[PDB]
Amino acid sequence: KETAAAKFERQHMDSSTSAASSSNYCNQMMKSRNLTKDRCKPVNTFVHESLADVQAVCSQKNVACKNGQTNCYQSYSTMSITDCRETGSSKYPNCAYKTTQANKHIIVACEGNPYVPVHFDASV
């Protein structure tokens, strides 16, 4: 099985671009990151910053997670992100996503030693 940290990296990291290229960014990325394999993952955020910068969020502002856990952290600075969400015409295996590029603070839950992101909670 995938470690929690590796799954976060696969689902949420895109350090190769500074921002979403086009309207087709999400369709391309959701597919290549294997998030459309058995089903269409309905919502997924990619972060366009270095892994180091995202990992550093675990030592930033400690905040509650949406679910009530206390191991979430909000980035002090805004980061380049792309929100990917299924559209109305999306039907597995023909997954279709809307691509929304933005610059926001990210909030992640962190766990482990080393203490690293294991879940993407939200952006603000």
Side-chain angles (χ1 to χ4, degrees):
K1 191 187 56 148
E2 206 170 18
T3 69
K7 177 170 173 164
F8 176 95
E9 294 164 347
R10 181 177 56 87
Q11 296 187 319
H12 302 297
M13 291 303 306
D14 187 9
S15 307
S16 75
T17 55
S18 62
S21 36
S22 65
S23 58
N24 288 316
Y25 174 86
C26 289
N27 286 333
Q28 290 159 9
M29 289 291 293
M30 293 300 286
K31 200 173 187 312
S32 57
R33 291 305 177 87
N34 297 334
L35 302 176
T36 65
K37 263 288 286 166
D38 314 336
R39 52 138 198 171
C40 301
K41 190 184 193 245
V43 174
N44 191 74
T45 303
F46 291 102
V47 181
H48 306 280
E49 303 295 345
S50 68
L51 181 52
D53 276 8
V54 170
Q55 290 171 333
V57 177
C58 298
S59 66
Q60 293 177 335
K61 189 72 175 195
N62 185 210
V63 298
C65 310
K66 290 204 170 176
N67 74 354
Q69 291 173 357
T70 60
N71 63 321
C72 278
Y73 295 83
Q74 182 165 325
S75 63
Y76 288 145
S77 183
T78 62
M79 292 182 174
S80 174
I81 66 175
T82 301
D83 170 84
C84 302
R85 295 201 169 226
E86 280 190 280
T87 63
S89 303
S90 185
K91 183 176 170 64
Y92 178 75
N94 297 321
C95 303
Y97 293 89
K98 171 178 168 52
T99 295
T100 310
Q101 170 68 32
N103 293 86
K104 320 270 73 127
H105 305 261
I106 66 172
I107 297 170
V108 292
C110 305
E111 276 184 30
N113 188 9
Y115 196 62
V116 295
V118 291
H119 156 83
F120 193 93
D121 203 49
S123 78
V124 38

